[PDB]
């Protein structure tokens, strides 16, 4: 994970497998359907809201 | 085996000898323990009100 945070593709040239970014993280980024992250579903946001405004205790 | 009778079942080493004791049987359902504890405690108090 640390390697991947500081990864840049331009630095990878001339290195073997050391030049490859961390498999999972990189492939996850390359995926487009991943790029859209769902909002915190209505039931959830309502539930939390009710507990911290109506009932005076945060979840 | 060969032209001789099979050994009785107890003459073989334990079939599950390699499975740990915590797996046979699994004690699952731990989540509920605390719940029922509270419950029972609560019930006890109920059963005093009847009496007293």
């Amino acid at each position: 994970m640390r390697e991947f945070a500081r990864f840049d593709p331009r630095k990878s040239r001339g290195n073997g497998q050391k030049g490859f970014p961390f498999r999972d993280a990189y492939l996850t980024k390359m995926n487009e359907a991943n790029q859209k992250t769902p909002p915190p579903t209505l039931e959830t946001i309502m539930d939390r809201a009710v507990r911290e405004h109506h009932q005076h205790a945060r979840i | 085996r060969r032209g001789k009778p099979r050994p009785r079942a107890g003459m073989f080493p334990d079939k599950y000898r390699r499975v740990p004791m915590l797996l046979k049987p699994q004690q699952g359902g731990q989540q509920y323990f605390n719940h029922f504890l509270i419950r029972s405690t609560n019930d006890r108090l109920t059963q005093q009100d009847v009496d007293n």
Partner: protein, 160 residues
């Protein structure tokens, strides 16, 4: 992540059609290909057989060719596209770069700076956007331009 069978069952005592068991070269395995492998009947060992049909390594090789065909077939049914060879000038801004051949470098992102990260390899272009480029001779456009959806328009899903 396929559930299908990729391995030929090992030779053993004769399997028979049972609950829970079928013959080895039964017609229901490998989409009926097992025909190719089958010696029918109560085979008389001494006098008859075709040796390769009982051989584990040979049989498994055949099955593997068949699986390969299945995959190839499905990968080609999966294409909606042709590769066209278009001169460097006329190609969209994203391909104006250098594009390493397959398995040569790290799988490559189309345009990190514009927020598109996807394999340039698998990016597919619409025959309608490349019209001016691909059929310059034709004058009038052969394909009518794509109609696109206004995502700012008030429509049934916006609750108006």
């Amino acid at each position: 992540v396929s559930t299908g069978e990729f391995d030929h069952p090992p030779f053993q005592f004769r399997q028979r059609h049972t609950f829970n068991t079928t013959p080895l070269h039964d017609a229901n395995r490998f989409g009926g290909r097992t025909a190719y492998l089958r010696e029918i009947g109560p085979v008389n060992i001494k006098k008859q057989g075709r040796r390769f049909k009982k051989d584990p390594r040979t049989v498994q090789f055949n099955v593997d060719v068949w699986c390969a065909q299945q995959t190839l077939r499905k990968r080609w049914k999966q294409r909606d596209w042709e590769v066209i060879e278009i001169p460097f000038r006329l190609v969209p801004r994203e391909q104006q770069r250098v594009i390493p051949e397959l398995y040569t470098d790290i799988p490559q992102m189309t345009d990190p700076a514009r927020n598109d990260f996807s394999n340039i390899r698998n990016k597919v272009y619409d025959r309608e956007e490349l019209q001016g480029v691909l059929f310059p001779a034709a004058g009038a456009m052969l394909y009518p331009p794509l109609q696109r959806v206004d995502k700012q328009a008030m429509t049934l899903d916006k609750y108006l």
